[PDB]
């Protein structure tokens, strides 16, 4: 029995890398971007069910490594393209945490929680990033309201101070291309629009139109200033 | 196990190593012809294929680079920096082989993240060579300036080297 548990644990660690295993097969749901992993039947059904708590982690890890694959495939210049690079960096910090178990598989013993306390720091990032992904599913992201949606999601999440700090890192790195065009427009008067990353658009009189979709994290009165 | 760790370096250095892979393009997918083995080696050696497929496209670009200095002073000086970025890939191969001999674990999963950081370096070089299949000096400056208008100073720094060196 425990050797059959151990090779299922190693199959599980490949699934969290983001790659297909041997006994854990991958079933496409929307194009295998929301991966419903399905393991075969086990002689002990319980240890199979402990793995069932862990396949949503690689499901949500597959949603955000393909979210940052999608926004760079259309070469978006907006601030969501810089938000996803933090997700690429948080995904790179993901893969070093898995390789500690590969170092532990040299000499070391797995337990039911030796899995869990590695997975629960990452299933908490998964459930935060899945709440990021479902707001994307409702319809967004253009530049100024990418910051607005991220501002809503941080002010919603207030109360769990552990991942409040990582969503602080997301909402301030996404604003880093935007606070360029703050400084270029309020101190020089020049504009850069790859698609458009700032709400103020041209068109003597020569009036301007603010768009009613690129409003920043705060409300309209500082945006008119 | 270890023979597959040796097999990835030879495709990282160029064309196929232990076995034949018969794929110039679209990725240099690795065939071992074995069924009784696990189904989780073909996918890792498909990650090692896209790193080696994208390597040989840079090397064949430097083979087409050879001119007296034909139809542009900008065109091969673009590739002079691309040989510098080809050179940076080789030093990252020099850390891998020193892991292989005896003098860490020789597993396929650890070297995946050691190649995942070149995967953000090399794949944005693939966008830089796709944009200029047919090209002329002066129009190269309109290629790299369209790549610096994107944000994210990860490859925006890398195209700013090319912007400062195409313009030179």
């Amino acid at each position: 029995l425990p050797s059959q548990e151990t090779c299922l644990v190693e199959d599980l660690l490949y699934i969290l890398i983001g790659v297909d295993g041997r006994y854990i097969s991958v079933q496409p749901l929307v194009g295998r971007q929301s991966r419903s992993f399905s393991v075969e039947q086990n002689l002990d059904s319980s240890v199979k069910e402990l793995v069932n708590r862990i396949l949503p982690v690689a499901t949500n890890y597959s949603t955000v490594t393909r979210f940052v694959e999608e926004n760079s495939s259309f070469e978006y210049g907006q601030v969501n393209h810089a938000l996803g690079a933090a997700m690429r960096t948080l995904g790179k910090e993901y893969m070093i945490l898995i390789s500690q178990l590969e170092h532990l598989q040299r000499q070391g013993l797995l337990s039911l929680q030796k899995l869990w306390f590695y997975i629960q720091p990452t299933l908490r990032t998964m459930e935060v990033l899945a709440s990021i992904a479902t707001s994307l599913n409702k319809g967004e992201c253009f530049g100024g309201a990418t910051l607005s949606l991220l501002h809503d999601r941080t002010f919603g999440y207030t109360g769990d101070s552990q991942a409040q700090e990582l969503c602080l890192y997301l909402t301030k790195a996404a604003s880093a291309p935007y606070f360029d065009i703050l400084e270029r427009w309020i101190y020089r008067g020049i504009i850069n629009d790859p698609y458009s990353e700032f709400m103020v658009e041209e068109h003597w009189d020569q009036r301007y139109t603010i768009v009613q979709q690129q409003i920043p994290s705060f409300l309209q009165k500082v945006a008119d200033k | 196990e270890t023979s597959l760790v040796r097999d990835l370096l030879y495709v990282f250095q160029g064309i196929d190593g232990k076995f034949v892979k018969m794929c110039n393009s679209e990725n240099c997918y690795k065939v071992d012809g074995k069924v009784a083995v696990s189904k989780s080696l073909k996918d890792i050696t498909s990650k090692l294929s896209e790193l080696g497929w994208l390597h040989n496209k840079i090397k064949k670009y430097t083979d087409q680079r050879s001119l007296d200095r034909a139809f542009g002073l900008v065109g091969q000086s673009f590739c002079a920096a691309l040989h510098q970025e080809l050179k940076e890939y080789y030093r990252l191969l020099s850390v891998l082989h020193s892991q292989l001999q005896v003098e860490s674990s020789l597993t396929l999963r650890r070297l995946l993240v050691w190649t995942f950081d070149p995967k953000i370096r090399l794949k944005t070089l693939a966008a830089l060579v796709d944009h200029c299949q047919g090209r002329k000096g002066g129009e190269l400056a309109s290629a790299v300036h369209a790549y610096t208008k994107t944000g994210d100073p990860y490859m925006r720094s890398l195209v700013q080297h090319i912007l400062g060196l195409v313009a030179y």
């Binding site: 070093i96 170092h103 | 650890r110």
Partner: peptide, 15 residues
């Protein structure tokens, strides 16, 4: 090896 890789990423973040 894992502690050396974390220090190798710290030198890459400074440069």
């Amino acid at each position: 090896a894992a502690a050396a890789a974390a220090a190798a990423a710290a030198a890459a973040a400074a440069a």
